[PDB]
Amino acid sequence: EYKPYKLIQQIYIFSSKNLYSQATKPLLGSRPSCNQNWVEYIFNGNELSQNENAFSFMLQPMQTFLTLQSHLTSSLKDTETLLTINKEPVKSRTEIFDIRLSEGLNHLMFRCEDKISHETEFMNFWINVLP
Amino acid sequence: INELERLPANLGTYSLDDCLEFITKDDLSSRMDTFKIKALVELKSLKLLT
C-alpha cells in the first residue's frame, strides 16, 4: 500500500504570525513572554503516501493558534479545497488558513477534490494541546 | 529544605554500570532514578521531623 499524492504537494502547519507578533513585540510596553517556542510541521506530499494519511503531534498551552498554509500545485485547475476542524469547516484567508484550537484533543480534516475529474485526497491531523 | 526543594524534578542518574545492560535509545535503563529517590527521602524525612 503506497500511493503518493497527485493533488496536494506540501502542507505547512506552522505557528500563527499574529500570536508571534504579540510574543516578541510587547504591546504598550508590556513584559515579554516567559519563553518562545515555534514549530512548522512540513509534510512533503510527494514522499508521503495515502492509506497512511493520519498524523499526530502535541503543542504547548501557549500555542493555541496555528495557520495551515496549504501548497496545492500539482492540480493546476480549479479544485475544491476545504478543511473541518472538529468536524466544523473553516474558510480560507497557495492558500493560507487560520485555526483556533481548543484545550483538548482536536482533529482537523483537510480535503481536496478536483471538479473536472473526481479524485479525492484527504489529510487528517490531531493536535494535542496540553492543559 | 530550600536547597533541596529547588532541584530539578527530572533528576536522573547515569551510572558506570549501565554499559553491561546495553541500554538502547528507546528503552528504560535500570537504576535510572537513584539520586531522585535519595533526594526525596532526604526531603520527606525533613518534613516528617515533628
Binding site: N128, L130, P131 | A9, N10, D26, D27, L28, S30, M32, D33, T34, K36, I37, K38, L40, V41, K44, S45, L46, K47, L48, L49
Partner: protein
Amino acid sequence: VYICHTCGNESINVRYHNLRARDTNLCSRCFQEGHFGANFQSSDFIRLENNWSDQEMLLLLEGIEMYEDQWEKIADHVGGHKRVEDCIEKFLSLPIEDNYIREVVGSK
C-alpha cells in the same frame, strides 16, 4: 501484584509510582509510550521494584505521609514481608536531626 492505572493490566516486573496521586501505579510499557494522563508529566514517576533500601525508605515515608495514625496499612504500602513492628523502630531510629545538631553544638 500491582495493577496499572491506565491499561488495567498487571505489572510485569517493575512499577512506576507517581508522586502526586500516591495511590496510582503505572506499568513500564505505559511509561515509554507515555499513555498516562495529560495532567502529569514523565518527571514525577519513580521506578520501583515489584518483587532496608531507598525504595522501602521512601515508601515508608510516603505511608507515614498518607496515613499518620494507622500503622497497619504502612506494611501494605511497602508490599509486606516483615513484622508490623520493624517499620516503627526503623522510623524512630532515623538520624535525621543529628547531622544538624552537631553543626551547632572526683568519682575516680
